[PDB]
């Protein structure tokens, strides 16, 4: 209605005197640690309830109706879990037997420590690729050749099919433990802000570029070509050229059968997603395409007749726990930090999506402990890093899921897939398992459709997407993530180093000040020039502030004072023989400043001192309380630069100048 | 006097309608690039005058007294410069003549391209230390041994004093050429903000660590001990331990002479600095101590009698230009970048100091181009990277210097030294030259006295000093600088990621809003809770903003709605059979925001939508125009979230809320 106020001009001291401050809280280091560490039994029950979330949803279960919905989702997710679990094992260069272990043991551990209800912990295509990247680098194929077979001229150094996998499993187990330990450090030290640096364009471009490396890696299994497992700079680029050079040594039985299930699985997935209003339960195309593949491959001897590529290496049994090979963490610490941060990023990403739909809150630090113990327990049973795939997550959710009981039932299907089931999957072609992974790449391949949308939005965030996408292609995949985090943080520094400074003016007959580069009918005070400077001054943008002040006043505070003394020497000699016109004051509207960075405040006092020699006052308008208290501690208020130079609002600074000129001509 | 206003409550649209905006300037790339490149001869003359500043100060000379001032400053600066060059030649592991070379040609090159008047370009202790470090890393001593001399049992692999100096000089010349190329690239691309990242505490800690390493190296040289030129991690600690282990294999005469000249030089420097009011011209302690050392060392055969360490390797002549061995840049690019940036930082610091002391202006890009051309010209004459030492610079300023003519005269001394002066310097002990370097370390060793001062000041900047000082000691010296810049950028990001949020309240009978954690007698509106959030929202501080909102409203917008929906299903079943109390609105005083990082504006819109479901309006107070224009493009103003939700000032929102409560109960 009517916005009218009437108060005196409290600049800095007319308001600080009659306003009593609040005494700050004392540190009291002796008692601070005592009050923090609680001794009551209620705190002991609270830390156990959070650490073990199973004690919350289990007592209040709904066995009446939940048991019917969990038994149907467990057998549905179990069949998809035992297939996607063994399919993702090829991305880690590990035998297909250890892929099923990643779908049974991590579920058992993510039952008494997990804080989610609609998350199916298991393998992941992008995560398994980063695991397989360090296996090929630290244990290539040309490192296990054995001379045996009485060759023609030289020693017969045939392939090492057999004991070669033993070094790959132990290497992947050491990586699994080191990833789990890092996740426990994040949960133990209660540091969760380290994963906030993974922005949406950063994680979006990373998963998009990772889909290309997954497509190239899986295409090698489909085409049945033998590459040289290149790694380093241009890893995906070099291996893509080698694939085109070895096209002649392909297998038509694998390409035709591999491309067939690609079109079938993609069509059924697209048909079921579009016509969702008529069929609520998604058709398990992953399961029906595998059962029919093993049946056809069992009739005709695809291994002998067509010389196809089958598994024929499933022993159908468990294995004793193997202690991790401690001592190889020096050459894997750099890559483990990249795998441990993407396993948690996707865990929270998929978790929060299915959290607002079921209306339940997911703890942040608890997921670090949940997946931390999961990866550690998985390392003792020859498993790789566990995560939650978005496709497998939607299986137990769309079919009907309430708690992790359905996930435990999903582990029973994998349980029988280790002892009894597995012999029937012997003649299954490797191209079939290498095709269900490519079908799930549609979600990440369609993520490129955001670049035209992000360009119309904030352009700096669109560059981060393209930067992370290209950098995670040239210099590997794990190194590209670290190059994306540094580039994303650098973009934040570049946005605060080059602020958006304006020529703030006054709206007639009011007190609201708007920029002069946006509005025309604005009147500036006679002589006074207002300047606003966002992105608080630090050591890097303190030089830009000088160029900012020199551009809004028209002159330079240094060159003007130098020309004054250059002409002053003519005055002291003429008696022996015989610019700064418009700028009267400078009101700095530093209202968007948060910190000081005393390294830069030393030049801030110099600005007030330089303009003081040329009779130009430098006033302040909207300095906050947390900043003014910081200027006093940094040695700014001397005998000449008093607090009266500062003001509370922007209009008080202009009103103080108009009253000073009227009272003093 | 009286601050009174009377205007309607223009929130967002009551002000944007009747206020016509200014049309932004069109891009017009063709005309923009056409208007940028000027064709008139005036712009050509201007850029020629700027690129070659020699054409400016030459026509306005003051020969009458400037001739005498420049000749005396030139002889003094030439003596000081040849002494500092023959001293710093040992820091670069190069023979002593190449120091004199590097003290002659850079001076000639910094005459037609430099834009300063009181800068004596030459060697530098830190730069020479870095050059020597990278030379020892890329060319150790055990890589040149030759088996010759018919030893006792094995081949006599004597030391290679001699032919290895050619390789060392070639490596130093390649390094200097690469540094010059990097500086010319930085100057041509007009990129000057890259050196603004070197804050005052960062460069202070770097200079402190460099002074410590220089002290260690000069103590190694004085004690005449033979180390193993360790490099890498903890190199200074390892070489100090090796020195302490080889104390017995020293020379008592050399150590005594070094300690004596150190004490004498320090005492004379202290006496001249303290009693400056009586003697304006500083006593050249370096010149007299070198003269007396050469006089004493020439009497007795210190090389034969006391087995002292002398130079005896001065050919007293020039050398033809040698083309640099291009191809060794991939293993020294980072070191060259570090050397170039530290040299430019020190040069700009000295220039700004001696320019604000003499009241003249110095350009940045022109100095960059000048030093780049100087290093390039030095690379073609077997010289190392040139800079401006603070001690040598103060000589020509205290003795009286006006233009670079004194610098050109300062090269005449080095000119006659290259040919004639230096044959008498044959029996001079190396410990004497290794002492003035330690004597000049007093300025950098006293820089540690700022840590107690910076701790009372901004503590985050005090940590950067200690972090840079320690990190530039453990992992070399060049790598410590890169670890310091990244640490400073991370500290800047942490200050904008964890803002200082408050509980802003209202002062009675006024319109100024202050924090509630600082003032006691403050009244908040009935139900309304004002919140201020500095450090504008980006992808990393969004969870921080969520936590801040949840802490300032007392509840969580998610848990409240979850409990409401959990209690709602009890209502729909009871008819078949038979928190958010105080918070009325949320005025976000986002006045300290500059950018919004649309990745974060999505979560902001999500927050606004979530609080709408619980009947809690989220209003804005001080959103700038540059932020609203960004939110409009980032898809924020839908059919429901209109612009009326925003306000211009903080009191307007409270007034609108009170009017709505009064008109609608």
Swiss-Prot record, chains A, B:
GO terms for biological process: animal organ morphogenesis; regulation of pH; regulation of protein localization. Interacts with IQGAP1. This interaction enhances the chloride-bicarbonate exchange activity of SLC26A4. Disulfide bonds: none annotated. InterPro entries: S04_transporter_CS (IPR018045), SLC26A/SulP_dom (IPR011547), SLC26A/SulP_fam (IPR001902), STAS_dom (IPR002645), STAS_dom_sf (IPR036513). One of its GO terms (molecular function) is iodide transmembrane transporter activity. Residues 1-70, 114-118, 196-201, 268-278, 349-367, 426-431, 491-665 are cytoplasmic. Highly expressed in the kidney (at protein level). Throughout the endolymphatic duct and sac, in distinct areas of the utricle and saccule, and in the external sulcus region within the cochlea. Expressed in the parotid gland. GO terms for cellular component: apical plasma membrane; brush border membrane; extracellular exosome; membrane. It is found in: Apical cell membrane; Cell membrane. This is Pendrin. It is a multi-pass membrane protein. Belongs to the SLC26A/SulP transporter (TC 2.A.53) family. Gene3D superfamilies: STAS domain. Sodium-independent transporter of chloride and iodide. Mediates electroneutral iodide-chloride, iodide-bicarbonate and chloride-bicarbonate exchange with 1:1 stoichiometry. Mediates elctroneutral chloride-formate exchange. Residues 92, 140-174, 223-246, 300-327, 389-404, 453-469 are extracellular. It catalyses: chloride(in) = chloride(out); iodide(out) = iodide(in); hydrogencarbonate(in) + chloride(out) = hydrogencarbonate(out) + chloride(in); iodide(in) + hydrogencarbonate(out) = iodide(out) + hydrogencarbonate(in). The chain crosses the membrane at residues 71-91, 93-113, 119-139, 175-195, 202-222, 247-267, 279-299, 328-348, 368-388, 405-425, 432-452, 470-490. Residues 518-657 form the STAS domain. Keywords: Cell membrane, Chloride, Membrane, Transmembrane, Transmembrane helix, Transport.
């Amino acid at each position: 209605c009517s916005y009218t106020v009437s108060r005196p001009v409290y600049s800095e001291l007319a308001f600080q005197q009659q306003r009593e401050r609040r005494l700050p809280e004392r540190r009291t280091l002796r008692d601070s640690l005592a009050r923090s560490c609680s001794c009551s039994r209620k705190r002991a029950f609270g830390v156990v309830k959070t650490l073990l979330p199973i004690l919350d949803w289990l007592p209040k279960y709904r066995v009446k109706e939940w048991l019917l919905s969990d038994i149907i989702s467990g057998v549905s997710t179990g069949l998809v879990g035992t297939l996607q679990g063994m399919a993702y094992a090829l991305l880690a260069a590990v035998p297909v037997q250890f892929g099923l272990y990643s779908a049974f043991f991590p579920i058992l551990t993510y039952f008494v420590f997990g804080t989610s209800r609609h998350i199916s912990v298991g393998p992941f295509p992008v995560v398994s690729l980063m695991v397989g990247s360090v296996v090929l680098s630290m244990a290539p194929d040309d490192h296990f050749l054995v001379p045996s077979g009485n060759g023609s001229a030289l020693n017969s150094t045939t392939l090492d099919t057999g004991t070669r996998d033993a070094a790959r499993v132990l290497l992947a187990s050491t990586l699994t433990l080191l990833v789990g330990i890092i996740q426990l450090v994040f949960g133990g030290l209660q540091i969760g802000f380290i994963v906030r640096y993974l922005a949406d364009p950063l994680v979006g471009g990373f998963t998009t570029a990772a889909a290309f490396q997954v497509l190239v890696s899986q295409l090698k299994i489909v085409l049945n070509v033998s590459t040289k497992n290149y790694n380093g700079i241009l890893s995906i680029i070099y291996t893509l050229i080698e694939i085109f050079q070895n096209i002649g040594d392909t297998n038509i039985a694998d390409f035709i059968a591999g491309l067939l299930t690609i079109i079938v699985c993609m069509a059924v997935k697209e048909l079921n997603d579009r016509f969702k209003h008529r069929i609520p339960v998604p058709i398990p195309i992953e399961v029906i395409v595998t059962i029919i593949a093993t049946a056809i491959s069992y009739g005709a001897n695809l291994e002998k007749n067509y010389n196809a590529g089958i598994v024929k290496s499933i022993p159908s049994g468990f294995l004793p726990p193997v202690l991790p090979s401690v001592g190889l963490f020096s050459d894997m610490l750099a890559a483990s930090f990249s795998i441990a941060v993407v396993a948690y990023a996707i865990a929270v990403s998929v978790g929060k999506v299915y959290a607002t739909k079921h209306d339940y809150v997911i703890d942040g630090n608890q997921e670090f402990i949940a997946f931390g113990i999961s990866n550690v327990f998985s390392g003792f049973f020859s498993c790789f890093v566990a995560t939650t795939a978005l496709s497998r997550t939607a299986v137990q959710e769309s079919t009907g899921g309430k708690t992790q009981v359905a996930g435990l039932i999903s582990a029973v299907i994998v349980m029988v897939a280790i002892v009894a089931l597995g012999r029937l999957l012997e003649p299954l072609q490797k191209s079939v398992l290498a095709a269900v992974v490519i079908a799930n790449l549609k979600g990440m391949f369609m993520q490129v459709c955001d670049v035209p949308r992000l360009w119309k939005q904030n352009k700096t965030d669109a560059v981060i997407w393209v930067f992370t996408c290209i950098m995670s292609i040239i210099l590997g995949l794990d190194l590209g993530l670290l190059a994306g985090l540094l580039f994303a943080l650098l973009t934040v520094v570049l946005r605060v180093q080059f602020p958006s400074w304006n020529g703030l003016g006054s709206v007639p007959s009011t007190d609201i000040y708007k920029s002069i580069t946006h509005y025309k009918n604005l009147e500036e005070p006679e002589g006074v020039k207002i300047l606003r400077f966002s992105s608080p001054i630090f050591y890097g943008n303190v030089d830009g502030f000088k160029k900012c002040i020199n551009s809004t006043v028209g002159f330079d505070a240094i060159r003007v004072y130098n020309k004054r003394l250059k002409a002053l020497r003519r005055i002291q000699k003429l008696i022996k023989k015989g610019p700064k016109v418009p700028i009267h004051s400078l009101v700095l509207d530093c209202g968007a400043v948060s910190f000081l960075d005393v390294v830069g405040v030393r030049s801030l006092r110099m600005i007030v001192k330089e303009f003081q020699r040329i009779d130009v006052n430098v006033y302040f308008a909207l300095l906050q309380d947390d900043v003014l208290e910081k200027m006093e501690q940094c040695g700014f208020f001397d005998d000449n630069i008093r607090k009266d130079r500062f003001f509370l609002t922007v209009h008080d600074a202009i009103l103080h100048l108009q009253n000073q000129v009227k009272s003093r001509e």
